[PDB]
PDB file of all heavy atoms in Angstrom:
ATOM      1  N   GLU A   1     150.067  33.906 205.926  1.00 48.03           N
ATOM      2  CA  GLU A   1     151.019  33.038 205.289  1.00 48.03           C
ATOM      3  C   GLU A   1     150.535  31.591 205.145  1.00 48.03           C
ATOM      4  O   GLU A   1     151.083  30.813 204.349  1.00 48.03           O
ATOM      5  CB  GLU A   1     152.352  32.985 206.044  1.00 48.03           C
ATOM      6  CG  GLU A   1     153.078  34.300 205.935  1.00 48.03           C
ATOM      7  CD  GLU A   1     152.575  35.416 206.851  1.00 48.03           C
ATOM      8  OE1 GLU A   1     151.842  35.153 207.809  1.00 48.03           O
ATOM      9  OE2 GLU A   1     152.924  36.566 206.536  1.00 48.03           O
ATOM     10  N   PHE A   2     149.514  31.210 205.882  1.00 46.55           N
ATOM     11  CA  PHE A   2     149.082  29.782 205.899  1.00 46.55           C
ATOM     12  C   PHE A   2     147.591  29.824 205.701  1.00 46.55           C
ATOM     13  O   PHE A   2     147.109  29.577 204.622  1.00 46.55           O
ATOM     14  CB  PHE A   2     149.591  29.130 207.168  1.00 46.55           C
ATOM     15  CG  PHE A   2     149.514  27.627 207.206  1.00 46.55           C
ATOM     16  CD1 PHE A   2     150.549  26.863 207.677  1.00 46.55           C
ATOM     17  CD2 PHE A   2     148.423  26.901 206.775  1.00 46.55           C
ATOM     18  CE1 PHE A   2     150.508  25.509 207.695  1.00 46.55           C
ATOM     19  CE2 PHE A   2     148.330  25.511 206.721  1.00 46.55           C
ATOM     20  CZ  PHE A   2     149.397  24.826 207.254  1.00 46.55           C
ATOM     21  N   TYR A   3     146.796  30.141 206.708  1.00 49.53           N
ATOM     22  CA  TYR A   3     145.313  30.213 206.588  1.00 49.53           C
ATOM     23  C   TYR A   3     144.955  31.169 205.475  1.00 49.53           C
ATOM     24  O   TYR A   3     144.019  30.883 204.738  1.00 49.53           O
ATOM     25  CB  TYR A   3     144.781  30.641 207.962  1.00 49.53           C
ATOM     26  CG  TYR A   3     143.276  30.711 208.077  1.00 49.53           C
ATOM     27  CD1 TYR A   3     142.397  29.866 207.413  1.00 49.53           C
ATOM     28  CD2 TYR A   3     142.769  31.637 208.995  1.00 49.53           C
ATOM     29  CE1 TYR A   3     141.035  30.022 207.646  1.00 49.53           C
ATOM     30  CE2 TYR A   3     141.419  31.766 209.196  1.00 49.53           C
ATOM     31  CZ  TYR A   3     140.549  30.958 208.513  1.00 49.53           C
ATOM     32  OH  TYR A   3     139.175  31.058 208.729  1.00 49.53           O
ATOM     33  N   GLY A   4     145.608  32.339 205.321  1.00 48.36           N
ATOM     34  CA  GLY A   4     145.224  33.219 204.230  1.00 48.36           C
ATOM     35  C   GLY A   4     145.403  32.549 202.891  1.00 48.36           C
ATOM     36  O   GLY A   4     144.555  32.711 202.033  1.00 48.36           O
ATOM     37  N   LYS A   5     146.467  31.821 202.623  1.00 46.99           N
ATOM     38  CA  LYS A   5     146.686  31.137 201.365  1.00 46.99           C
ATOM     39  C   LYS A   5     145.669  30.027 201.191  1.00 46.99           C
ATOM     40  O   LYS A   5     145.153  29.806 200.067  1.00 46.99           O
ATOM     41  CB  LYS A   5     148.062  30.480 201.349  1.00 46.99           C
ATOM     42  CG  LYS A   5     149.263  31.418 201.399  1.00 46.99           C
ATOM     43  CD  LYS A   5     150.529  30.767 200.925  1.00 46.99           C
ATOM     44  CE  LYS A   5     151.559  31.882 200.801  1.00 46.99           C
ATOM     45  NZ  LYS A   5     152.887  31.281 200.427  1.00 46.99           N
ATOM     46  N   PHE A   6     145.266  29.354 202.288  1.00 43.70           N
ATOM     47  CA  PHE A   6     144.241  28.328 202.191  1.00 43.70           C
ATOM     48  C   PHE A   6     142.937  28.945 201.730  1.00 43.70           C
ATOM     49  O   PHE A   6     142.311  28.462 200.790  1.00 43.70           O
ATOM     50  CB  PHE A   6     144.071  27.713 203.579  1.00 43.70           C
ATOM     51  CG  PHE A   6     142.944  26.695 203.669  1.00 43.70           C
ATOM     52  CD1 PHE A   6     143.107  25.412 203.230  1.00 43.70           C
ATOM     53  CD2 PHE A   6     141.691  27.036 204.192  1.00 43.70           C
ATOM     54  CE1 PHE A   6     142.168  24.443 203.265  1.00 43.70           C
ATOM     55  CE2 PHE A   6     140.733  26.051 204.257  1.00 43.70           C
ATOM     56  CZ  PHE A   6     140.930  24.774 203.796  1.00 43.70           C
ATOM     57  N   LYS A   7     142.531  30.001 202.392  1.00 46.26           N
ATOM     58  CA  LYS A   7     141.222  30.563 202.035  1.00 46.26           C
ATOM     59  C   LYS A   7     141.291  31.127 200.605  1.00 46.26           C
ATOM     60  O   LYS A   7     140.243  31.059 199.925  1.00 46.26           O
ATOM     61  CB  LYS A   7     140.812  31.551 203.089  1.00 46.26           C
ATOM     62  CG  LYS A   7     141.620  32.814 202.998  1.00 46.26           C
ATOM     63  CD  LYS A   7     140.700  33.898 202.399  1.00 46.26           C
ATOM     64  CE  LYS A   7     141.418  35.219 202.575  1.00 46.26           C
ATOM     65  NZ  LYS A   7     141.290  36.007 201.308  1.00 46.26           N
ATOM     66  N   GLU A   8     142.385  31.721 200.149  1.00 46.18           N
ATOM     67  CA  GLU A   8     142.470  32.197 198.760  1.00 46.18           C
ATOM     68  C   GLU A   8     142.299  31.018 197.790  1.00 46.18           C
ATOM     69  O   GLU A   8     141.609  31.177 196.768  1.00 46.18           O
ATOM     70  CB  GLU A   8     143.888  32.806 198.475  1.00 46.18           C
ATOM     71  CG  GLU A   8     144.201  34.109 199.196  1.00 46.18           C
ATOM     72  CD  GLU A   8     145.681  34.426 199.282  1.00 46.18           C
ATOM     73  OE1 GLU A   8     146.474  33.707 198.650  1.00 46.18           O
ATOM     74  OE2 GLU A   8     146.084  35.353 200.025  1.00 46.18           O
ATOM     75  N   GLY A   9     142.929  29.897 198.100  1.00 48.84           N
ATOM     76  CA  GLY A   9     142.807  28.710 197.228  1.00 48.84           C
ATOM     77  C   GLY A   9     141.428  28.126 197.272  1.00 48.84           C
ATOM     78  O   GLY A   9     140.969  27.638 196.217  1.00 48.84           O
ATOM     79  N   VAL A  10     140.753  28.102 198.376  1.00 47.23           N
ATOM     80  CA  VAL A  10     139.370  27.582 198.416  1.00 47.23           C
ATOM     81  C   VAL A  10     138.509  28.486 197.530  1.00 47.23           C
ATOM     82  O   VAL A  10     137.703  27.945 196.752  1.00 47.23           O
ATOM     83  CB  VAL A  10     138.874  27.524 199.859  1.00 47.23           C
ATOM     84  CG1 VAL A  10     137.396  27.160 199.936  1.00 47.23           C
ATOM     85  CG2 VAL A  10     139.722  26.474 200.613  1.00 47.23           C
ATOM     86  N   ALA A  11     138.704  29.795 197.654  1.00 44.60           N
ATOM     87  CA  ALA A  11     137.841  30.733 196.907  1.00 44.60           C
ATOM     88  C   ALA A  11     138.164  30.673 195.419  1.00 44.60           C
ATOM     89  O   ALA A  11     137.261  30.738 194.585  1.00 44.60           O
ATOM     90  CB  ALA A  11     138.044  32.146 197.446  1.00 44.60           C
ATOM     91  N   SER A  12     139.408  30.572 195.037  1.00 43.39           N
ATOM     92  CA  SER A  12     139.752  30.619 193.618  1.00 43.39           C
ATOM     93  C   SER A  12     139.563  29.279 192.969  1.00 43.39           C
ATOM     94  O   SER A  12     139.448  29.178 191.725  1.00 43.39           O
ATOM     95  CB  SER A  12     141.207  31.081 193.486  1.00 43.39           C
ATOM     96  OG  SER A  12     142.039  29.980 193.901  1.00 43.39           O
ATOM     97  N   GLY A  13     139.560  28.213 193.707  1.00 49.24           N
ATOM     98  CA  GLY A  13     139.445  26.870 193.116  1.00 49.24           C
ATOM     99  C   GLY A  13     140.808  26.323 192.698  1.00 49.24           C
ATOM    100  O   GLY A  13     140.803  25.235 192.151  1.00 49.24           O
ATOM    101  N   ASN A  14     141.899  27.009 192.977  1.00 53.44           N
ATOM    102  CA  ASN A  14     143.211  26.557 192.545  1.00 53.44           C
ATOM    103  C   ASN A  14     144.118  26.653 193.733  1.00 53.44           C
ATOM    104  O   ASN A  14     144.916  27.556 193.948  1.00 53.44           O
ATOM    105  CB  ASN A  14     143.780  27.436 191.426  1.00 53.44           C
ATOM    106  CG  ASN A  14     144.822  26.818 190.575  1.00 53.44           C
ATOM    107  OD1 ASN A  14     145.202  27.209 189.451  1.00 53.44           O
ATOM    108  ND2 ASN A  14     145.353  25.737 191.067  1.00 53.44           N
ATOM    109  N   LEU A  15     144.081  25.690 194.609  1.00 50.30           N
ATOM    110  CA  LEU A  15     145.007  25.601 195.703  1.00 50.30           C
ATOM    111  C   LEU A  15     146.100  24.583 195.372  1.00 50.30           C
ATOM    112  O   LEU A  15     145.875  23.401 195.144  1.00 50.30           O
ATOM    113  CB  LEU A  15     144.228  25.148 196.938  1.00 50.30           C
ATOM    114  CG  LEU A  15     145.124  24.966 198.195  1.00 50.30           C
ATOM    115  CD1 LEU A  15     145.668  26.314 198.642  1.00 50.30           C
ATOM    116  CD2 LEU A  15     144.338  24.327 199.313  1.00 50.30           C
ATOM    117  N   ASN A  16     147.346  25.065 195.336  1.00 51.04           N
ATOM    118  CA  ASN A  16     148.495  24.219 195.097  1.00 51.04           C
ATOM    119  C   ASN A  16     149.724  25.034 195.457  1.00 51.04           C
ATOM    120  O   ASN A  16     150.196  25.799 194.590  1.00 51.04           O
ATOM    121  CB  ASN A  16     148.566  23.730 193.651  1.00 51.04           C
ATOM    122  CG  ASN A  16     149.706  22.767 193.408  1.00 51.04           C
ATOM    123  OD1 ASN A  16     150.313  22.167 194.325  1.00 51.04           O
ATOM    124  ND2 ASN A  16     150.062  22.535 192.141  1.00 51.04           N
ATOM    125  N   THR A  17     150.212  24.935 196.702  1.00 51.23           N
ATOM    126  CA  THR A  17     151.306  25.833 197.082  1.00 51.23           C
ATOM    127  C   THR A  17     152.150  25.076 198.107  1.00 51.23           C
ATOM    128  O   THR A  17     151.677  24.232 198.875  1.00 51.23           O
ATOM    129  CB  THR A  17     150.814  27.184 197.639  1.00 51.23           C
ATOM    130  OG1 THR A  17     151.929  28.008 198.015  1.00 51.23           O
ATOM    131  CG2 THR A  17     149.944  27.007 198.901  1.00 51.23           C
ATOM    132  N   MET A  18     153.403  25.422 198.107  1.00 46.07           N
ATOM    133  CA  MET A  18     154.374  24.743 199.027  1.00 46.07           C
ATOM    134  C   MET A  18     155.204  25.798 199.689  1.00 46.07           C
ATOM    135  O   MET A  18     155.602  26.783 199.056  1.00 46.07           O
ATOM    136  CB  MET A  18     155.191  23.772 198.181  1.00 46.07           C
ATOM    137  CG  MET A  18     155.975  22.773 199.023  1.00 46.07           C
ATOM    138  SD  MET A  18     156.929  21.702 197.951  1.00 46.07           S
ATOM    139  CE  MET A  18     155.728  20.609 197.199  1.00 46.07           C
ATOM    140  N   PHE A  19     155.470  25.668 200.987  1.00 45.50           N
ATOM    141  CA  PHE A  19     156.177  26.681 201.755  1.00 45.50           C
ATOM    142  C   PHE A  19     156.734  26.048 203.033  1.00 45.50           C
ATOM    143  O   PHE A  19     156.278  25.008 203.406  1.00 45.50           O
ATOM    144  CB  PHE A  19     155.308  27.907 202.080  1.00 45.50           C
ATOM    145  CG  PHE A  19     154.012  27.577 202.753  1.00 45.50           C
ATOM    146  CD1 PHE A  19     153.927  27.587 204.154  1.00 45.50           C
ATOM    147  CD2 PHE A  19     152.890  27.252 202.021  1.00 45.50           C
ATOM    148  CE1 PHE A  19     152.760  27.253 204.801  1.00 45.50           C
ATOM    149  CE2 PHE A  19     151.693  26.933 202.680  1.00 45.50           C
ATOM    150  CZ  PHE A  19     151.646  26.923 204.098  1.00 45.50           C
ATOM    151  N   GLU A  20     157.673  26.690 203.674  1.00 49.77           N
ATOM    152  CA  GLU A  20     158.143  26.235 204.990  1.00 49.77           C
ATOM    153  C   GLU A  20     157.427  26.968 206.101  1.00 49.77           C
ATOM    154  O   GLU A  20     156.960  28.108 205.974  1.00 49.77           O
ATOM    155  CB  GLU A  20     159.645  26.419 205.083  1.00 49.77           C
ATOM    156  CG  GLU A  20     160.383  25.393 204.215  1.00 49.77           C
ATOM    157  CD  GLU A  20     161.889  25.489 204.348  1.00 49.77           C
ATOM    158  OE1 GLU A  20     162.374  26.337 205.106  1.00 49.77           O
ATOM    159  OE2 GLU A  20     162.549  24.618 203.728  1.00 49.77           O
ATOM    160  N   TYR A  21     157.344  26.318 207.260  1.00 48.76           N
ATOM    161  CA  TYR A  21     156.589  26.875 208.361  1.00 48.76           C
ATOM    162  C   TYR A  21     157.157  26.323 209.650  1.00 48.76           C
ATOM    163  O   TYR A  21     157.864  25.329 209.636  1.00 48.76           O
ATOM    164  CB  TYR A  21     155.091  26.570 208.235  1.00 48.76           C
ATOM    165  CG  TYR A  21     154.206  27.665 208.826  1.00 48.76           C
ATOM    166  CD1 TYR A  21     153.979  28.832 208.102  1.00 48.76           C
ATOM    167  CD2 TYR A  21     153.545  27.485 210.040  1.00 48.76           C
ATOM    168  CE1 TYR A  21     153.181  29.826 208.619  1.00 48.76           C
ATOM    169  CE2 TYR A  21     152.741  28.500 210.555  1.00 48.76           C
ATOM    170  CZ  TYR A  21     152.559  29.670 209.833  1.00 48.76           C
ATOM    171  OH  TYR A  21     151.735  30.664 210.357  1.00 48.76           O
ATOM    172  N   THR A  22     156.849  26.924 210.816  1.00 48.38           N
ATOM    173  CA  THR A  22     157.233  26.430 212.115  1.00 48.38           C
ATOM    174  C   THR A  22     155.973  26.143 212.902  1.00 48.38           C
ATOM    175  O   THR A  22     155.104  27.023 213.020  1.00 48.38           O
ATOM    176  CB  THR A  22     158.163  27.377 212.877  1.00 48.38           C
ATOM    177  OG1 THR A  22     159.362  27.532 212.146  1.00 48.38           O
ATOM    178  CG2 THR A  22     158.451  26.807 214.257  1.00 48.38           C
ATOM    179  N   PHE A  23     155.829  24.945 213.420  1.00 46.24           N
ATOM    180  CA  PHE A  23     154.735  24.582 214.310  1.00 46.24           C
ATOM    181  C   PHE A  23     155.197  24.637 215.730  1.00 46.24           C
ATOM    182  O   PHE A  23     156.165  23.955 216.059  1.00 46.24           O
ATOM    183  CB  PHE A  23     154.266  23.177 214.016  1.00 46.24           C
ATOM    184  CG  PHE A  23     153.601  22.970 212.649  1.00 46.24           C
ATOM    185  CD1 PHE A  23     153.416  21.680 212.162  1.00 46.24           C
ATOM    186  CD2 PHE A  23     153.107  24.031 211.907  1.00 46.24           C
ATOM    187  CE1 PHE A  23     152.779  21.403 210.985  1.00 46.24           C
ATOM    188  CE2 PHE A  23     152.498  23.765 210.709  1.00 46.24           C
ATOM    189  CZ  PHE A  23     152.278  22.488 210.234  1.00 46.24           C
ATOM    190  N   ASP A  24     154.539  25.461 216.550  1.00 46.06           N
ATOM    191  CA  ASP A  24     155.087  25.694 217.913  1.00 46.06           C
ATOM    192  C   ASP A  24     154.030  25.825 218.988  1.00 46.06           C
ATOM    193  O   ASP A  24     154.312  26.350 220.077  1.00 46.06           O
ATOM    194  CB  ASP A  24     155.957  26.961 217.881  1.00 46.06           C
ATOM    195  CG  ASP A  24     155.185  28.218 217.555  1.00 46.06           C
ATOM    196  OD1 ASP A  24     154.009  28.145 217.182  1.00 46.06           O
ATOM    197  OD2 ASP A  24     155.788  29.305 217.668  1.00 46.06           O
ATOM    198  N   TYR A  25     152.806  25.375 218.705  1.00 45.21           N
ATOM    199  CA  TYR A  25     151.739  25.441 219.737  1.00 45.21           C
ATOM    200  C   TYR A  25     151.693  24.142 220.536  1.00 45.21           C
ATOM    201  O   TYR A  25     151.453  23.091 219.968  1.00 45.21           O
ATOM    202  CB  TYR A  25     150.422  25.684 219.026  1.00 45.21           C
ATOM    203  CG  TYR A  25     149.239  25.795 220.014  1.00 45.21           C
ATOM    204  CD1 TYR A  25     149.270  26.819 220.988  1.00 45.21           C
ATOM    205  CD2 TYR A  25     148.143  24.944 219.971  1.00 45.21           C
ATOM    206  CE1 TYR A  25     148.200  26.908 221.860  1.00 45.21           C
ATOM    207  CE2 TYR A  25     147.069  25.030 220.819  1.00 45.21           C
ATOM    208  CZ  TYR A  25     147.132  26.039 221.764  1.00 45.21           C
ATOM    209  OH  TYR A  25     146.133  26.218 222.693  1.00 45.21           O
ATOM    210  N   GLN A  26     151.930  24.229 221.852  1.00 46.20           N
ATOM    211  CA  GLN A  26     151.950  23.085 222.730  1.00 46.20           C
ATOM    212  C   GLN A  26     152.833  21.945 222.255  1.00 46.20           C
ATOM    213  O   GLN A  26     152.493  20.758 222.323  1.00 46.20           O
ATOM    214  CB  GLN A  26     150.535  22.538 222.936  1.00 46.20           C
ATOM    215  CG  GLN A  26     149.619  23.628 223.527  1.00 46.20           C
ATOM    216  CD  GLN A  26     148.229  23.151 223.794  1.00 46.20           C
ATOM    217  OE1 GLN A  26     147.677  23.525 224.835  1.00 46.20           O
ATOM    218  NE2 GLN A  26     147.607  22.453 222.883  1.00 46.20           N
ATOM    219  N   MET A  27     153.978  22.380 221.695  1.00 46.86           N
ATOM    220  CA  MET A  27     154.946  21.425 221.193  1.00 46.86           C
ATOM    221  C   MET A  27     156.278  22.107 221.029  1.00 46.86           C
ATOM    222  O   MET A  27     156.327  23.342 220.987  1.00 46.86           O
ATOM    223  CB  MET A  27     154.514  20.797 219.845  1.00 46.86           C
ATOM    224  CG  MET A  27     154.406  21.895 218.776  1.00 46.86           C
ATOM    225  SD  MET A  27     153.607  21.335 217.265  1.00 46.86           S
ATOM    226  CE  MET A  27     154.998  20.374 216.625  1.00 46.86           C
ATOM    227  N   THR A  28     157.308  21.253 220.983  1.00 45.22           N
ATOM    228  CA  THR A  28     158.634  21.814 220.716  1.00 45.22           C
ATOM    229  C   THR A  28     158.560  22.424 219.321  1.00 45.22           C
ATOM    230  O   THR A  28     158.026  21.817 218.390  1.00 45.22           O
ATOM    231  CB  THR A  28     159.696  20.745 220.857  1.00 45.22           C
ATOM    232  OG1 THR A  28     159.784  19.783 219.784  1.00 45.22           O
ATOM    233  CG2 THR A  28     159.361  19.750 221.999  1.00 45.22           C
ATOM    234  N   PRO A  29     159.093  23.648 219.131  1.00 43.02           N
ATOM    235  CA  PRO A  29     159.011  24.257 217.793  1.00 43.02           C
ATOM    236  C   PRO A  29     159.688  23.350 216.782  1.00 43.02           C
ATOM    237  O   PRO A  29     160.811  22.869 216.974  1.00 43.02           O
ATOM    238  CB  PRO A  29     159.719  25.613 217.974  1.00 43.02           C
ATOM    239  CG  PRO A  29     159.675  25.895 219.452  1.00 43.02           C
ATOM    240  CD  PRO A  29     159.780  24.503 220.092  1.00 43.02           C
ATOM    241  N   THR A  30     158.966  23.103 215.701  1.00 43.47           N
ATOM    242  CA  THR A  30     159.372  22.126 214.709  1.00 43.47           C
ATOM    243  C   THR A  30     159.210  22.730 213.320  1.00 43.47           C
ATOM    244  O   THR A  30     158.092  23.166 212.984  1.00 43.47           O
ATOM    245  CB  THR A  30     158.462  20.887 214.803  1.00 43.47           C
ATOM    246  OG1 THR A  30     158.609  20.328 216.138  1.00 43.47           O
ATOM    247  CG2 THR A  30     158.838  19.868 213.775  1.00 43.47           C
ATOM    248  N   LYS A  31     160.286  22.787 212.564  1.00 43.04           N
ATOM    249  CA  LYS A  31     160.244  23.331 211.183  1.00 43.04           C
ATOM    250  C   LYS A  31     159.734  22.234 210.250  1.00 43.04           C
ATOM    251  O   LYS A  31     160.170  21.097 210.351  1.00 43.04           O
ATOM    252  CB  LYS A  31     161.630  23.825 210.742  1.00 43.04           C
ATOM    253  CG  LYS A  31     162.327  24.860 211.556  1.00 43.04           C
ATOM    254  CD  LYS A  31     163.461  25.530 210.740  1.00 43.04           C
ATOM    255  CE  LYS A  31     163.208  25.204 209.269  1.00 43.04           C
ATOM    256  NZ  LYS A  31     164.456  24.788 208.561  1.00 43.04           N
ATOM    257  N   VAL A  32     158.866  22.648 209.344  1.00 41.55           N
ATOM    258  CA  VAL A  32     158.241  21.744 208.417  1.00 41.55           C
ATOM    259  C   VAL A  32     158.195  22.346 207.036  1.00 41.55           C
ATOM    260  O   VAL A  32     158.274  23.540 206.909  1.00 41.55           O
ATOM    261  CB  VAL A  32     156.858  21.325 208.891  1.00 41.55           C
ATOM    262  CG1 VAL A  32     156.924  20.556 210.200  1.00 41.55           C
ATOM    263  CG2 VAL A  32     155.934  22.534 209.040  1.00 41.55           C
ATOM    264  N   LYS A  33     158.009  21.474 206.033  1.00 41.93           N
ATOM    265  CA  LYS A  33     157.604  21.863 204.696  1.00 41.93           C
ATOM    266  C   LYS A  33     156.126  21.513 204.572  1.00 41.93           C
ATOM    267  O   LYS A  33     155.743  20.392 204.985  1.00 41.93           O
ATOM    268  CB  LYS A  33     158.433  21.100 203.631  1.00 41.93           C
ATOM    269  CG  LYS A  33     158.231  21.741 202.232  1.00 41.93           C
ATOM    270  CD  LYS A  33     159.320  21.261 201.232  1.00 41.93           C
ATOM    271  CE  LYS A  33     160.538  20.792 202.027  1.00 41.93           C
ATOM    272  NZ  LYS A  33     161.649  20.410 201.142  1.00 41.93           N
ATOM    273  N   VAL A  34     155.340  22.386 204.038  1.00 41.47           N
ATOM    274  CA  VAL A  34     153.893  22.191 203.877  1.00 41.47           C
ATOM    275  C   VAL A  34     153.573  22.298 202.394  1.00 41.47           C
ATOM    276  O   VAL A  34     154.045  23.215 201.736  1.00 41.47           O
ATOM    277  CB  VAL A  34     153.124  23.344 204.644  1.00 41.47           C
ATOM    278  CG1 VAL A  34     151.614  23.147 204.437  1.00 41.47           C
ATOM    279  CG2 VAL A  34     153.548  23.272 206.112  1.00 41.47           C
ATOM    280  N   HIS A  35     152.744  21.344 201.945  1.00 38.12           N
ATOM    281  CA  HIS A  35     152.167  21.439 200.608  1.00 38.12           C
ATOM    282  C   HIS A  35     150.672  21.413 200.740  1.00 38.12           C
ATOM    283  O   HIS A  35     150.178  20.464 201.355  1.00 38.12           O
ATOM    284  CB  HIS A  35     152.671  20.240 199.824  1.00 38.12           C
ATOM    285  CG  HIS A  35     152.175  20.224 198.413  1.00 38.12           C
ATOM    286  ND1 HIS A  35     152.167  19.028 197.709  1.00 38.12           N
ATOM    287  CD2 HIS A  35     151.670  21.195 197.578  1.00 38.12           C
ATOM    288  CE1 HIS A  35     151.676  19.275 196.531  1.00 38.12           C
ATOM    289  NE2 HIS A  35     151.387  20.573 196.373  1.00 38.12           N
ATOM    290  N   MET A  36     149.958  22.453 200.312  1.00 38.04           N
ATOM    291  CA  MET A  36     148.509  22.441 200.326  1.00 38.04           C
ATOM    292  C   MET A  36     148.042  22.216 198.916  1.00 38.04           C
ATOM    293  O   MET A  36     148.557  22.856 197.995  1.00 38.04           O
ATOM    294  CB  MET A  36     147.956  23.815 200.840  1.00 38.04           C
ATOM    295  CG  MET A  36     148.249  23.951 202.344  1.00 38.04           C
ATOM    296  SD  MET A  36     147.248  25.271 203.049  1.00 38.04           S
ATOM    297  CE  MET A  36     148.017  26.595 202.148  1.00 38.04           C
ATOM    298  N   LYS A  37     147.058  21.331 198.741  1.00 39.88           N
ATOM    299  CA  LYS A  37     146.574  21.071 197.372  1.00 39.88           C
ATOM    300  C   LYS A  37     145.112  20.690 197.423  1.00 39.88           C
ATOM    301  O   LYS A  37     144.719  19.934 198.314  1.00 39.88           O
ATOM    302  CB  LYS A  37     147.457  19.998 196.711  1.00 39.88           C
ATOM    303  CG  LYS A  37     147.233  20.042 195.192  1.00 39.88           C
ATOM    304  CD  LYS A  37     148.037  18.958 194.475  1.00 39.88           C
ATOM    305  CE  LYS A  37     147.907  19.251 192.983  1.00 39.88           C
ATOM    306  NZ  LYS A  37     148.746  18.256 192.288  1.00 39.88           N
ATOM    307  N   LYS A  38     144.332  21.204 196.496  1.00 40.49           N
ATOM    308  CA  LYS A  38     142.950  20.764 196.404  1.00 40.49           C
ATOM    309  C   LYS A  38     142.854  19.287 196.143  1.00 40.49           C
ATOM    310  O   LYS A  38     143.640  18.709 195.371  1.00 40.49           O
ATOM    311  CB  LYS A  38     142.326  21.585 195.281  1.00 40.49           C
ATOM    312  CG  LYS A  38     140.845  21.550 195.037  1.00 40.49           C
ATOM    313  CD  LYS A  38     140.519  22.319 193.714  1.00 40.49           C
ATOM    314  CE  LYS A  38     139.416  23.335 193.925  1.00 40.49           C
ATOM    315  NZ  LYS A  38     139.068  23.532 195.359  1.00 40.49           N
ATOM    316  N   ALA A  39     141.861  18.644 196.733  1.00 42.26           N
ATOM    317  CA  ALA A  39     141.650  17.220 196.461  1.00 42.26           C
ATOM    318  C   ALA A  39     141.109  17.033 195.058  1.00 42.26           C
ATOM    319  O   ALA A  39     140.573  17.956 194.437  1.00 42.26           O
ATOM    320  CB  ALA A  39     140.659  16.612 197.460  1.00 42.26           C
ATOM    321  N   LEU A  40     141.198  15.841 194.543  1.00 42.32           N
ATOM    322  CA  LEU A  40     140.873  15.524 193.151  1.00 42.32           C
ATOM    323  C   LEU A  40     139.453  15.940 192.873  1.00 42.32           C
ATOM    324  O   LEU A  40     139.202  16.427 191.758  1.00 42.32           O
ATOM    325  CB  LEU A  40     141.094  14.046 192.881  1.00 42.32           C
ATOM    326  CG  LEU A  40     140.702  13.536 191.478  1.00 42.32           C
ATOM    327  CD1 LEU A  40     141.652  14.091 190.444  1.00 42.32           C
ATOM    328  CD2 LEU A  40     140.648  12.026 191.486  1.00 42.32           C
TER     329      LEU A  40
END
């Protein structure tokens, strides 16, 4: 859901995706919105 979409976008050359996620490693679980995008 996260790393897999990143690697698909690196390989295809078209990374631009937005999704919700929970970060919970060594921290209070925190809901976030994530946007991944290739740099210019």
Side-chain angles (χ1 to χ4, degrees):
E1 291 78 16
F2 193 136
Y3 183 34
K5 295 199 170 175
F6 174 81
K7 74 105 168 136
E8 292 160 10
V10 174
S12 72
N14 202 162
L15 178 65
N16 184 16
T17 180
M18 194 181 287
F19 55 93
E20 289 185 357
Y21 211 78
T22 297
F23 293 165
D24 63 351
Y25 181 59
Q26 302 182 138
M27 62 192 285
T28 75
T30 299
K31 303 197 17 224
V32 296
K33 192 165 338 183
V34 178
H35 182 201
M36 290 196 294
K37 197 183 190 177
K38 189 188 230 10
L40 176 68

